[PDB]
Design a protein around this ligand. Structure first.
Ligand SMILES: [Zn+2]
Lengths: 134, 120, 208, 68, 292
RNA sequence: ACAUAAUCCCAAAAAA
């Protein structure tokens, strides 16, 4: 498995998670194209992370075929918070919290296989007949 | 309501809109091609065709003359418009002011970019 | 007895009596009977009335739509609608039809799509008076004001409030037909018709 | 107005995930007919065009500087 | 007929395993692939019987899935065509200005495919008997599949529902996603496998013996085997749809020949259902023509 | 004869 991580980078975790779930389960190529033409602040960063992950995959692991690489797991954690003073009216100060995001990428070789297909009639006729016999 | 209405706003006043059109048309006739937002471009098309047609009317004619002087203040644009750009489009009717799309977006507002160009 | 039409426009007419009459024109492009569905409990049978533009065939793609047009031997059509026929004696198989089907002096009902106003305030919808524009009134001018009473917490279902208006089906009743043109396929109908010109409308037999 | 009580995790997740549908993924990817590079659909390439537009801008600046 | 087909498939699998073993017996080789499709690309690997499609996979998944044909040293080849030593690899696709090669390959793949389908349907009923004739490609956009049948099939008429069922089974095998195999075999073992088919025997004996190359390429799809002098369609996912248009009966030298013909869909794209019906009419008319 | 939706806790029933 090929792991890559980026910490102490300042971006919205909730916003980066949008592009993080986007490439999860998807193949390297499709994820690359997506992140390239995806419009957001996380697009560039996650693109860099992916590119570095591919470079590490090729150089360190010495992978024979690049097409056998896909994205198995992607996650976004929260780092330290920078507290800033936001000046408001009537002599009151609010607390502006600048967040941070630690991006983690876990890659596994082999062809990507994901099936979300579920037959309704089969699952119903099986679960009902098994629940009636229990 | 927006029902049956051309002549968009784009967050500018009437004078600001007209002046914007005059500036974009200035750059367009000067450089023969320009890059701007898709809305401003699509809006600029018709006015460009209008100025071209006004140039096609006549050089000696006063109506076309004062119209051309009204929209374009610059003294450099008019002779290049009438003597050079106009006679090549003489045969064309709707064949000028082509619009194309630009692959990337701005780093700030991510505004959709488009280019307007006359036929060479 | 009825057919699907297309709103054309309006214009005044002058009767020999000298009385002015404001009428609207309903144009008939094409009409064909597609499917005939018999029923029992409803005590009536349904027929298919269809007005095509023939252009939409390529830009509108569906399996069932195209297969329907092809298997029925029907040319490409823009609008397919249904009509309820109570009388079983007047029911005919699939046939093309003309705008001569209507006669002058007959009162008809017109079903069409009302003009969409988009998102509209409490005004222009339920026709509320609103608040005054003066005398210390602050930002209450177009506001609906109070809604419910302290007794009942929740507001009653069906309460009048600002929202989307128009773009829905409406039927106008009691519209007299002054005259019809077969060759030009034009229908002269006295009254008002829902929606803008070129929008699909429906001419049906009224109830009097 | 002010919130009556603190939001539970479940409501937050169900609100921030399902209805927004995250980011809907369509296919914008198409191969450039010229250089064969991957670019956006219904749009000019970002490889064989931007360089030619910069060369055309430099040629227009050189022609405008030579004419003056 | 099932035992003979299973014995022929087992003998063909054993002959393919023996030929592959004797040819790949030396696993030490140098394969260098260098060339510009897109700008320049330079790669060096060590393998025997190297596949250029594996190099397409080496580049990326995109160029891999978009790979149709492989141009090597100026000579067009299939993506399954083995490469040796130094080679210049180019990727040819349908959208390119040279549709000819992928078109011919497409028509020959379609002929083969139904070559399997008809046989499988004829394996459903033991009553029928099938003998394969040679296939005739037509650059006009047509392909003619020639065969002969038992007397019982000569007496019984080909009702419309039949051909519809053949089409359904064809699409069935089309979404079944079965990979094509490319084998290199001698004319002898091939003669032995094709013994039950007279026309193919005559084909190999007459044509292949005059050829200096004793190495013949057998394309295997499922339990079906076909002889091809040219490239084959990359996968079963490449072909979106298929149709059976019509048949013909030719009389030559007091012999009857039954020729089936149909059409194919390139790059998994169809304009509409209307133009599809139009394509049916066009297909049948092109069958009526029988170009030669 | 009082003011949001009914029955004096469901539905009904009958007159040890
Ligand atoms: Zn390009």
């Amino acid at each position: 498995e090929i792991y890559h991580c980026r910490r102490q980078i300042k971006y919205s975790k909730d916003k980066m998670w949008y592009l993080a779930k986007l490439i999860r389960g998807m193949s390297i190529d499709q994820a690359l194209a997506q992140l390239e033409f995806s419009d957001k602040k996380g697009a560039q960063i996650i693109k860099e992370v992916l590119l570095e992950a591919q470079d590490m995959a090729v150089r360190d692991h010495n992978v024979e075929f690049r097409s056998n690489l896909y994205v198995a797991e992607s996650t976004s954690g929260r780092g330290q918070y920078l507290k800033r003073i936001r000046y408001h009216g009537r002599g009151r100060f609010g607390i502006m919290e600048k967040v941070f995001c630690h991006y983690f990428v876990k890659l596994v070789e082999g062809x990507x296989x994901x099936x979300x297909x579920x037959x309704x009639x089969x699952x119903x006729x099986x679960x009902x007949x098994x629940x009636x016999x229990x | 309501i927006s029902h049956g209405r051309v002549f968009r706003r784009l967050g500018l006043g009437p004078e600001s809109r007209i002046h914007l059109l005059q500036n974009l048309l200035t750059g367009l006739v000067r450089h023969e091609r320009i890059e701007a937002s898709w809305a401003r471009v699509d809006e600029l098309r018709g006015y460009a065709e209008k100025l071209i047609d006004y140039g096609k009317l006549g050089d000696t004619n006063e109506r076309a003359m004062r119209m051309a002087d009204f929209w374009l203040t610059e003294k450099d644009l008019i002779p290049k418009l009438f003597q050079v750009l106009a006679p090549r489009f003489q045969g064309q009717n709707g064949g000028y002011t082509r619009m194309l799309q630009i692959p990337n977006r701005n780093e700030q507002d991510r505004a959709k970019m488009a280019v307007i160009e006359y036929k060479g | 007895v009825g057919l699907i039409a297309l709103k054309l426009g309006m214009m005044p007419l002058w009767t020999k009596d000298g009385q002015k009459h404001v009428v609207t024109l309903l144009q008939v492009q094409d009409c064909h009977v597609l499917k005939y569905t018999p029923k029992e409990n409803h005590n009536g049978r349904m027929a298919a009335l269809t007005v095509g533009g023939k252009t939409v065939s390529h830009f509108h793609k569906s399996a069932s739509i195209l297969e329907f047009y092809q298997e029925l031997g029907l040319p490409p059509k823009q609008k397919v609608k249904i009509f309820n026929v109570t009388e079983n004696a007047v029911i005919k198989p699939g046939t093309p039809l003309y705008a001569a089907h209507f006669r002058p002096g007959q009162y008809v009902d017109v079903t069409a799509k009302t003009i969409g106003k988009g998102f509209q305030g409490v005004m222009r919808r339920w026709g509320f008076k609103g608040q005054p524009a003066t005398h210390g009134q602050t930002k209450t001018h177009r506001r609906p004001g109070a809604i419910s009473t302290g007794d009942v917490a929740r507001v009653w279902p069906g309460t009048k409030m600002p929202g989307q208006l128009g773009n829905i089906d409406r039927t106008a009743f009691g519209l007299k037909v002054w005259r019809i043109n077969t060759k030009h396929n034009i229908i002269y109908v006295n009254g008002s018709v829902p929606g803008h010109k070129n929008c699909l409308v429906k001419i049906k037999d009224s109830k009097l | 107005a002010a919130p009556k009580n603190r939001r539970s995790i479940e409501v937050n997740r169900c609100r921030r995930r399902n209805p927004q549908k995250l980011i809907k993924v369509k296919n914008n990817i198409d191969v450039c007919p010229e250089c064969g590079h991957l670019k956006q659909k219904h749009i000019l390439c970002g490889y064989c065009x931007x360089x030619x537009x910069x060369x055309x801008x430099x040629x227009x600046x050189x022609x405008x500087x030579x004419x003056x | 007929x099932x035992x003979x087909x299973x014995x022929x498939x087992x003998x063909x699998x054993x002959x393919x395993x023996x030929x592959x073993x004797x040819x790949x017996x030396x696993x030490x080789x140098x394969x260098x692939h260098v060339g510009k499709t897109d700008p320049g690309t330079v790669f060096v690997m060590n393998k025997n019987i190297s596949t250029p499609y594996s190099c397409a996979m080496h580049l990326s998944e995109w160029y891999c899935r978009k790979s149709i044909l492989a141009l090597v040293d100026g000579q067009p080849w299939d993506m399954y065509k083995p490469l040796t030593k130094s080679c210049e690899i180019k990727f040819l696709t349908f959208k390119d200005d040279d549709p000819g090669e992928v078109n011919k390959a497409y028509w020959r793949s379609c002929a083969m495919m139904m070559g399997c389908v008809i046989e499988r349907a004829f394996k459903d009923e033991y009553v029928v008997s099938l003998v394969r004739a040679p296939e005739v490609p037509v650059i006009a956009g047509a392909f003619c599949y020639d065969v002969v049948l038992d007397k019982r099939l000569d007496e019984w008429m080909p009702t419309k529902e039949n051909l519809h069922s053949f089409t359904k089974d064809a699409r069935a095998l089309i979404y079944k996603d079965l990979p094509f195999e490319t084998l290199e075999v001698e004319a002898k073992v091939a003669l032995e496998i094709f013994q039950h088919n007279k026309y193919k025997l005559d084909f190999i004996e007459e044509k292949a013996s005059q050829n200096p190359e004793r190495i013949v390429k057998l394309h295997r799809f499922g339990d079906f085997i076909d002889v091809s002098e040219g490239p084959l369609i990359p996968r079963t996912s490449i072909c979106f749809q298929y149709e059976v248009s019509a048949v013909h009966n030719l009389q030559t030298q007091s012999s009857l020949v039954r020729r089936f013909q149909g059409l194919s869909l390139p790059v998994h794209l169809r304009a509409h259902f209307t133009i599809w019906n139009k394509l049916l009419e066009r297909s049948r008319k092109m069958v009526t023509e029988d170009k030669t």
